[PDB]
Amino acid sequence: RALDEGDIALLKTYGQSTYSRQIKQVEDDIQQLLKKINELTGIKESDTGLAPPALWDLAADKQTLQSEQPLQVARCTKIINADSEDPKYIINVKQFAKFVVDLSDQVAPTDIEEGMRVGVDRNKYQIHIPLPPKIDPTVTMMQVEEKPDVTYSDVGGCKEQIEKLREVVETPLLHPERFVNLGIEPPKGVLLFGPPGTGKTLCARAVANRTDACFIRVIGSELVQKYVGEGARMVRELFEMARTKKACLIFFDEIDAIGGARFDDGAGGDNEVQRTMLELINQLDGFDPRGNIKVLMATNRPDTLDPALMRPGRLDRKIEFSLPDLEGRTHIFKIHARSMSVERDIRFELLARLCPNSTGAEIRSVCTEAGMFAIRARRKIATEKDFLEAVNKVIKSYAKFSA
């Protein structure tokens, strides 16, 4: 029952409008002109720099044409491997080259160091420009974080955890007593662990309370990556950036993939993790003890590898909290109520009692919900909006427990 050929054309011409063929021809011309004007562009030149550089900065491009014979030492750039006692430099080059050169007369051997990229002039491959690249990928820009974290009221002060860590982080940075009265160096490390909650907020508070040597938030899940050696290099530049930034503290977070689990499936399941473990130990071993740099490692469960017994000499003072009581919860309410347009005339102690061990994250969540209910009611007031504050906090506590 197909009956299409010839028939379909007749019924396509059977109905239509009186000028349906006209608009079809009109819109085909519309599309024809659309393609023509897309071909008939405006600035029809992919290369840009039309005039603002090509009128005055061009005049100095004549100067670089007069100095075109110099400034050609670019050619190719590659790392260096090692050197002899002083004059000769045995170098591995990105051209796979077993390369040695007399370093260019303008470059002293002191500046050039092993493992640094240097450009070579094709004529003689002299060490002309030893570029200190210090190039950071985008993910590494996330591993490094903001310095001025801003101080608060001990970010919901849990007096136990903060006061135990101040003598191990704040005190060494103050350096008032570490040298003589107590043994040589302050305690070798801090492990600020705990269930998802107050973890690393006290670190941020310590960062604000201390000098400009401020922490960077690196993630172990980011650190573990594809292929081999990238995680090793990432940890190395992590230490380099922290060392350069006034010897700031390095905050390792979520240490359950960089150290992995306590096991490896067949020593081939997670072996790049093991590659990162060897180099990280080589970096944060300290060698010569130094009260300048600090390291803090924070996870939720003590799932660290075998170095968990070497760290008593390197990373000691394992502390935790994430267990807010009534006094802790109500103080977190106060510091959060410092924000927004709320005032403490609300009986927020009642809601602190209602939620047993609701962390500090949920309290911030509950405060966020209270503001959301205020804007939903379209009232920007929240100082005296306490009954509405209590109502939205209790109903959302109901939803969190059972929705």
Partner 1 sequence: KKTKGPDAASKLPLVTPHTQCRLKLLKLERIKDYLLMEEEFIRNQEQMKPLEEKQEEERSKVDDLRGTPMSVGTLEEIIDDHAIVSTSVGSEHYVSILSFVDKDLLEPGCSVLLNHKVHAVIGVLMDDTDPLVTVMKVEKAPQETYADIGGLDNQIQEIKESVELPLTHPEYYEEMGIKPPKGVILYGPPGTGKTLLAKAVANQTSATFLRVVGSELIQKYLGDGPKLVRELFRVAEEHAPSIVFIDEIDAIGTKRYDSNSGGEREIQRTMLELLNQLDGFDSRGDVKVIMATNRIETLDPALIRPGRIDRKIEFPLPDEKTKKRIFQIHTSRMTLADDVTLDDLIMAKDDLSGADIKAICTEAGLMALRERRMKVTNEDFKKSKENVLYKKQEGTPEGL
Partner 2 sequence: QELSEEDKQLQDELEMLVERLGEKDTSLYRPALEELRRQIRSSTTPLKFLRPHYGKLKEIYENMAPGENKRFAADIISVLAMTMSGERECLKYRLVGSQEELASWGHEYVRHLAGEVAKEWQELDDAEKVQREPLLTLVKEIVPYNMAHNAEHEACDLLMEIEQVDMLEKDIDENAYAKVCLYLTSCVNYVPEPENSALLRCALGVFRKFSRFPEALRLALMLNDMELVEDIFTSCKDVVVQKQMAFMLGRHGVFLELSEDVEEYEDLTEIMSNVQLNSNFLALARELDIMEPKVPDDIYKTHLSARMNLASSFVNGFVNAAFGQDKLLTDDGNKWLYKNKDHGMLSAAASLGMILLWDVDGGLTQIDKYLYSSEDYIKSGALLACGIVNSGVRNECDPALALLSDYVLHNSNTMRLGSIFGLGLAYAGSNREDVLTLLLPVMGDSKSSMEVAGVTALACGMIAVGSCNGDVTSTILQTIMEKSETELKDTYARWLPLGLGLNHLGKGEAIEAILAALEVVSEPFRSFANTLVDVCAYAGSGNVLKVQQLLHICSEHFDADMGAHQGVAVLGIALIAMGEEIGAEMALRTFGHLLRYGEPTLRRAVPLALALISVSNPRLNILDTLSKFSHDADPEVSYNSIFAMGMVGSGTNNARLAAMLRQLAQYHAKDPNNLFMVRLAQGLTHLGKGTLTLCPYHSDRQLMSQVAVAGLLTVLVSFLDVRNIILGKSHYVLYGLVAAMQPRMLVTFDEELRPLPVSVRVGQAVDVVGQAGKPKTITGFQTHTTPVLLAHGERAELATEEFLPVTPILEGFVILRKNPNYD
Ligand X SMILES: Nc1ncnc2c1ncn2[C@@H]1O[C@H](COP(=O)(O)OP(=O)(O)OP(=O)(O)O)[C@@H](O)[C@H]1O
Of how many residues is the chain composed? Answer: 403
CA atoms within 13 Å, Cβ hemisphere of 188: 13
Residues β-bridged to residue 83: none
Per-residue binding string, partner 1, 279-318, x by CB under 8 A, is ----------------------------------------
Residue 179, interface with partner 2 (CB under 8 A)? no
Residue 13, interface with partner 2 (CB under 8 A)? yes
Cα–Cα distance, 127 to 100 (Å, whole number): 10
Among 12, 15, 138, 268, binds partner 2 (CB under 8 A): 15
Instruction: Indicate the Cα dihedral angle 249, 255, 257, 263, nearest 10°.
Output: 130
Tokens standing for residue 322: 């994430």
Residue 91 φ then ψ, to 5°? -135, 135
**DSSP code for 170:** I
Residue 77 binding result from partner 1, partner 2, ligand X, none, given CB thresholds of 5 to 8 Å by partner type: partner 1
E strand spans, 75-181 = 76-78, 91-92, 98-99, 118-120, 127-129
Could you tell me which of 162, 170, 149 has the C-alpha nearest to residue 321? 162
Q: Is residue 20 exposed (0-12), middle (13-18) or buried (19+ Cβ within 10 Å)?
A: exposed
Cβ proximity to ligand X, 128 vs 205, nearer residue: 205
Cα–Cα distance, 255 to 224 (Å, whole number): 10
Residue 8 binding result from partner 2, partner 1, ligand X, none, given CB thresholds of 5 to 8 Å by partner type: partner 1
In whole angstroms, how close is the CB of 301 to partner 1 at the nearest point?
10
Among 13, 82, 87, 94, binds partner 1 (CB under 8 A): 94
In whole angstroms, how close is the CB of 52 to partner 1 at the nearest point?
8
Establish whether 87 is an annotated binding residue: no
In whole angstroms, how close is the CB of 154 to ligand X at the nearest point?
8
Residue 332 binding result from ligand X, partner 1, partner 2, none, given CB thresholds of 5 to 8 Å by partner type: ligand X
Residue 199 binding result from partner 2, ligand X, partner 1, none, given CB thresholds of 5 to 8 Å by partner type: ligand X
Residue 184, interface with partner 2 (CB under 8 A)? no
Cα–Cα distance, 15 to 299 (Å, whole number): 74
If you write DSSP's letter for every residue of 218-251 in order, what string do you get? Answer: EEHHHHS-SSSSHHHHHHHHHHHHHHHTTSPPEE
Residue 383, interface with partner 1 (CB under 8 A)? no
Residue 19, interface with partner 2 (CB under 8 A)? yes
Residue 357, interface with partner 1 (CB under 8 A)? no
Residue 14, interface with partner 2 (CB under 8 A)? yes
Residue 320 binding result from ligand X, partner 1, partner 2, none, given CB thresholds of 5 to 8 Å by partner type: none
Q: Which stretch binds partner 1 (CB under 8 A): 25-33, 163-171, 175-183, 233-241?
A: 25-33
CA atoms within 13 Å, Cβ hemisphere of 231: 25
Among 12, 31, 35, 43, binds partner 2 (CB under 8 A): 43
Residue 282 binding result from partner 2, partner 1, ligand X, none, given CB thresholds of 5 to 8 Å by partner type: none
Residue 200 binding result from partner 1, partner 2, ligand X, none, given CB thresholds of 5 to 8 Å by partner type: ligand X
In whole angstroms, how close is the CB of 168 to partner 1 at the nearest point?
26
Residue 3, interface with partner 2 (CB under 8 A)? yes
In whole angstroms, how close is the CB of 255 to partner 2 at the nearest point?
40
Establish whether 156 is an annotated binding residue: no
Cα–Cα distance, 2 to 4 (Å, whole number): 5
Residue 229 Cα distances to 81, 204, 266, angstroms: 17, 30, 20
In whole angstroms, how close is the CB of 207 to partner 2 at the nearest point?
25
Residue 114, interface with partner 1 (CB under 8 A)? no
Question: Which residues in this chain contact ligand X in the complex, by CB under 6 A?
Answer: 155-156, 158, 196-201, 300, 332, 335, 359-361, 364
Contacts of 367-371 with CB under 8 Å at 24 or more apart are 367/333, 367/336, 367/337, 367/339, 367/340, 367/342, 369/393, 369/396, 370/340, 370/342, 371/340
Tokens standing for residue 170: 């704040």
- Known binding residues are 194-201
